[PDB]
Amino acid sequence: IVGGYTCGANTVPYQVSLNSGYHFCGGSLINSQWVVSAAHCYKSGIQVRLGEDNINVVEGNEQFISASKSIVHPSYNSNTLNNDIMLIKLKSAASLNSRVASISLPTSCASAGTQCLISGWGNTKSSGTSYPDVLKCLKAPILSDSSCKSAYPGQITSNMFCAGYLEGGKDSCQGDSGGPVVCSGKLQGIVSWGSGCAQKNKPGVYTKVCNYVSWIKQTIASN
């Protein structure tokens, strides 16, 4: 997260860190056994880390649970990032409480101009590299489809939306991938891609979760 703020410990209780010996992506807890992330975050060996603030210090509220199964979207295209969504099933159920909690799936898609909360442990610089230990947050508005398509001509599908600031300076970034975009208490986006981070006229691009709710529900009900 570039240009954001320190969230505060466990104030984003649905945020997870995906670990393969090191933090590599975010995710969102949607019930006690399932996490939603980005398909481009797929790795063979994944441990889900819930209740994290500092990802390099055991502070007392963590749950570390290995994945039993990953399910990349059937239509995921790694070239275009169309359908950049994956479900991860936990080997054992998380214990839900104040610091570890699920985020609701959307019934409606999100509205242009809604300010959403984007969070993660990704790079905090638009040029250079600095990775935080504690969870970072950003308030960012949903941009119109027209503005998004103008920013990334020939690249935005119906399964993507832009959020952030055309002036630059505030955005998600590498290492935030797979994490949440929460708008009005619903998971509306997944950190997916962008040209650099926090660059002028190059806002973040996010997987449009409202298009996948039927797939998510059907998949959870059968696995």
Residue 172 annotated as binding site: yes
Shortest distance, position 99 Cβ to Ca ion, whole Å: 11
Nearer to Na ion, 68 or 184 (CB): 184
Shortest distance, position 62 Cβ to Ca ion, whole Å: 5
Q: Which of 23, 40, 53, 192 is catalytic?
A: 40
Interaction of residue 130 with Na ion, rule CB under 5 A: no
Alpha helices in the chain (DSSP H): 145-151, 213-220
Q: SS3 of 129, please?
A: coil
Residue 68 annotated as binding site: no
d(CA 196, CA 168): 11
Tell me whether residue 40 is one of the annotated catalytic residues.
yes
| Residues found in the chain | 223
| Contact of 67 with 89, CB cutoff 8 Å | yes
Window 85-114: residues binding Na ion (CB under 5 A): 106-108
The residue number with the shortest CB distance to Na ion is 107
3-state helix, strand, coil in the chain (%, to 5): 10, 35, 55
Q: Which of 28, 37, 177, 192 is catalytic?
A: 177
Q: What Rg do the C-alpha atoms of the chain give, in angstroms?
A: 16
Shortest distance, position 214 Cβ to Na ion, whole Å: 14
Sequence-distant (≥ 6) Cβ neighbours of residue 141 within 8 angstroms: 113, 114, 115, 116, 163, 164, 165
Residue 171 annotated as binding site: yes
Draw the binding track, 177-216, toward Na ion (x: CB under 5 A; -: no contact).
---------x------------------------------
Q: What is the dihedral of CA 99, 91, 40, 201, to 10 degrees?
A: -10
d(CA 96, CA 148): 36
Shortest distance, position 32 Cβ to Ca ion, whole Å: 20
Window 45-84: residues binding Ca ion (CB under 5 A): 52, 54, 59
Nearer to Ca ion, 59 or 145 (CB): 59
Q: Which residues pair with 66 in a beta bridge?
A: 47
Tell me whether residue 177 is one of the annotated catalytic residues.
yes
Residue 57 annotated as binding site: yes
Alpha helices in 105-212 (DSSP H): 145-151
Q: Report, as residue numbers or ranges, the catalytic residues.
A: 40, 84, 177
Which residues are part of a known binding site? Answer: 52, 54, 57, 62, 171-172, 174-175, 177
Binding-site ranges for Na ion (CB under 5 A)? 106-108, 186
Binding-site ranges for Ca ion (CB under 5 A)? 52, 54, 59
